Design a protein around this ligand. Structure first.
Ligand SMILES: [Mg+2]
Length: 284
């Protein structure tokens, strides 16, 4: 039962989010919500080399409600601060899994050490929706160190797979999840292939960061391109026509309505108009 390729998408125009994040936006819920549940958004920042500066490049403080933001750093360093009294820097290999939930107020920027030295900068920020019963859950954070994320070798010297969230071959990703899903960081060596089995009905997407991937023997994906698969199927194949770096996102759909606006993604317009009212008063 092959997870058919249902769509493949060319690389978007890169655009600036603040002054620290040059992102190519892979998908957004308003057109991909039903298709990609539980995932809501994926920004691919960089790769871009920054020079030394005294500036603090990044994004200003802004609210979030009703979902989770995941930062996956490949190069560079980002400090995050949230109103839950929390903070910290996330570096190469590190992951942060922030639950905004009932409401959070965060800014993210280049760490002071990265500002001083500069260098290559590359990361992925992913939005993960919450079940309706947890939309007003308490905001929290998980700082996950590179050393805490499994790194399995694929068979036949095909490359690596890092389980950020979910499970693969008995390795449970360190990221806690309200909903069944996988977030996999895959490195694949040229001329090697691997097959995967995934749950039936799980919405699945592949995103190539580097290299040239052959998907299901049918679709060729390249840098900053997205593969959207048939959820009904159960298995999957990838071959790297070039040394590839990709993300595999899968997950059990959340069969609940999505009503979102900007930084608020809720279930009802009344909850959206409610969030816009809570933020303009100062509840956040
Ligand atoms: Mg944010």
């Amino acid at each position: 039962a092959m997870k058919k390729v249902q769509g493949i998408y060319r690389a978007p125009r890169q655009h600036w989010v603040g002054d620290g994040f040059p992102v190519r936006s892979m998908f957004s819920y308003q057109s991909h919500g039903k298709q990609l549940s539980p995932f809501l958004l994926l920004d691919y920042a960089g790769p871009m080399d920054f020079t030394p500066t005294t500036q603090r490049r990044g994004v200003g403080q802004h609210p979030h409600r009703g979902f989770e933001t995941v930062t996956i750093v490949y190069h560079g360093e980002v400090e995050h601060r949230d109103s839950t009294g929390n903070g910290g820097i996330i570096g190469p290999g590190d992951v942060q899994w922030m639950t905004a939930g009932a409401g959070i107020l965060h800014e993210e920027f280049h760490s002071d050490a990265f500002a001083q030295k500069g260098g290559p900068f590359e990361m992925v920020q992913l939005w993960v929706n919450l079940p309706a019963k947890d939309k007003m859950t308490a905001p929290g954070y998980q700082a996950i160190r590179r050393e805490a994320i499994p790194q399995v070798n694929l068979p036949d010297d095909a490359g690596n797979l890092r389980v950020i969230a979910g499970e693969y071959a008995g390795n449970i990703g360190p990221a806690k999840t309200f909903s069944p899903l996988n977030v996999w960081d895959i490195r694949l060596t040229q001329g090697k292939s691997c097959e995967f089995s995934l749950p039936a009905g799980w919405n699945t997407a592949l995103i190539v960061l580097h290299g040239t991937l052959l998907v299901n023997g049918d679709a060729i994906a390249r840098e900053a391109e997205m593969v959207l698969l048939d959820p009904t199927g159960t298995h999957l194949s990838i071959e790297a026509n070039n040394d590839t770096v990709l993300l595999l996102l899968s997950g059990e759909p959340i069969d609940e309505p999505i009503v979102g606006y900007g930084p608020f993604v809720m279930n009802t317009q009344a909850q959206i108009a409610e969030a816009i009212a809570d933020f303009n008063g100062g509840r956040f």
